[PDB]
Design a protein around this ligand. Structure first.
Ligand code: NA
Length: 121
């Protein structure tokens, strides 16, 4: 049908838009603390603390399969990265402080990203 084609183009444009949103949010972690999933070889007890780990590489693979249906779903994953980091690591660590600064600078990107998703439709 044409109406599924029209749905599919919308998804396809959104994914293109979220690519840009992702790339900007990843430009706010220049250490690359959040680039890859936490190694279970290096931190064996990590899944005793964190039931839904999340990182940027994972979020990229879901995107290029067009797996994000709205902006909420994208935001939900992004928030896991920050919330997982600030729970596992203490206040006085470079990990927690990298999550705080990513949160505060990514708020600027996601607030205008919300207006662009609405505005086009
Ligand atoms: Na903690």
């Amino acid at each position: 049908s044409m109406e599924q084609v029209a749905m599919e183009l919308r998804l396809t444009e959104l994914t293109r838009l979220l690519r840009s949103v992702l790339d900007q949010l990843q430009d706010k972690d220049p250490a690359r603390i959040f680039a890859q999933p936490v190694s279970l070889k290096e931190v064996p007890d990590y899944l005793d603390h964190i039931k839904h780990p999340m990182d940027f590489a994972t979020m990229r693979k879901r995107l290029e399969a067009q797996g994000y249906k709205n902006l909420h779903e994208f935001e939900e994953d992004f928030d896991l990265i920050i919330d997982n980091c600030m729970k596992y690591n203490a206040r006085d660590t470079v990990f927690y402080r990298a999550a705080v600064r990513l949160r505060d600078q990514g708020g600027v990107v996601l607030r205008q990203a919300r207006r662009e998703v609405d505005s086009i439709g």
